[PDB]
Design a protein around this nucleic acid. Structure first.
Ligand SMILES: [Zn+2]
Ligand SMILES: [Zn+2]
Ligand SMILES: [Zn+2]
Ligand SMILES: [Zn+2]
Lengths: 66, 66
DNA sequence: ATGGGCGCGCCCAT
DNA sequence: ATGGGCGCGCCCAT
């Protein structure tokens, strides 16, 4: 029955770096991880102008300025 | 050049229904979709007893009582 | 500080 | 209404 069907846990999103075996369930997850290798921090606090790799961690940090 | 890498768009989560050709990028998209085949409406409003197939839709509905 | 995992609920067309 | 797409933000270990 299709009532007992559970979507199989998968990791279709494989890290593009040949020497890295990480795979993820969601694409947004992989995109964040790739920043570990590139050292990219696309987010910035317009206050202290500090850069972050994740948007959530920046949001968290900005709420503390005042 | 890894710095220019962007995860290509894909849809690895396919509907198990043989007569359905739908594929999603995320599994939570597919878990929702399969309720179209089963007609399941799990989220019920405790104020009016009305049933919905999705929790985001119920959530918004719950607000029409206030 | 920052990463893996992923749920809640928005956008917007139906 | 109710479906596909998908981002914000939380949880909790790093
Ligand atoms: Zn990797
Ligand atoms: Zn700052
Ligand atoms: Zn289907
Ligand atoms: Zn109601």
């Amino acid at each position: 029955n299709l009532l007992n069907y559970v979507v199989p846990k998968m990791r279709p999103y494989a890290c593009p770096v040949e020497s890295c075996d990480r795979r993820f369930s969601r694409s947004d997850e992989l995109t964040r991880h790739i920043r570990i290798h590139t050292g990219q921090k696309p987010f910035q606090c317009r206050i202290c102008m500090r850069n972050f790799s994740r948007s959530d961690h920046l949001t968290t940090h900005i709420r503390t300025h005042t």
